[PDB]
Design a protein around this ligand. Sequence first.
Ligand SMILES: NC(=O)c1ccc[n+]([C@@H]2O[C@H](COP(=O)([O-])OP(=O)(O)OC[C@H]3O[C@@H](n4cnc5c(N)ncnc54)[C@H](O)[C@@H]3O)[C@@H](O)[C@H]2O)c1
Length: 222
Amino acid sequence: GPFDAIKQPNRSEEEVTQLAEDFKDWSKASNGWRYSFITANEKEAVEDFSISGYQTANDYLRATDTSTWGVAGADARQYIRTVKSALNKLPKYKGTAYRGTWVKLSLLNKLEEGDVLVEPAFTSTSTLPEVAKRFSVVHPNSPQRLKRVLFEVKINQGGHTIAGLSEYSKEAEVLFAPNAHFRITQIERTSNHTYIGVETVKASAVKNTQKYNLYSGEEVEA
Ligand SMILES: NC(=O)c1ccc[n+]([C@@H]2O[C@H](COP(=O)([O-])OP(=O)(O)OC[C@H]3O[C@@H](n4cnc5c(N)ncnc54)[C@H](O)[C@@H]3O)[C@@H](O)[C@H]2O)c1
């Protein structure tokens, strides 16, 4: 089965921890000329994104109405600009990654191979399926019907490692700037869980398919 490896249980703590440390070391080692230009504010913004920053940033990005945010809105906009700037200075990652999440059942029921999913927030992934799984275990209180999803993401563009600035974790994290587009290559719906193979695509290259907002579930105009 295409998702057998990720349906199976996890590798040992020792191995997962080692793989994450290896990925952190690789990430630091792959810092390039763009990295010399990373500012103090950029470094800090990214360092704290994984702990707390993502909660405000992603909320802002997914909000239907930010008119009410006041000073918080100016702050969130600044933070987002700062993290986006930093991300472009960090090393690219290409290969497979994973994302554990929740999705509206109403959206899941529409999805087919070839459809494109657009995430309005930043998109967090891990190179380690063990890490990704941890994020489909509980969700905040929610008024909609949500289902667990495990994404297997083929990354050929857009993903940058933040693991070289995440000293407190073993998360092997690869982050995407807002509005990342992912084309569905395979979907399996089994025993109340959903496994979705996706590939990164350039938004300007998407043609003659259906795009969906991954968070709201609403169609996104071609
Ligand atoms: N999700 C992953 O697999 C993953 C991978 C690497 C690191 N992380 C780490 O986890 C944190 C980021 O967590 P995240 O990726 O869940 O952040 P997120 O901002 O995407 O999601 C925040 C919360 O909302 C839920 N959510 C997201 N999209 C939803 C949707 N369409 N409908 C309903 N609920 C939805 C999430 O499951 C989570 O409970 C950071 O600390 C980051 O370092 C997560």
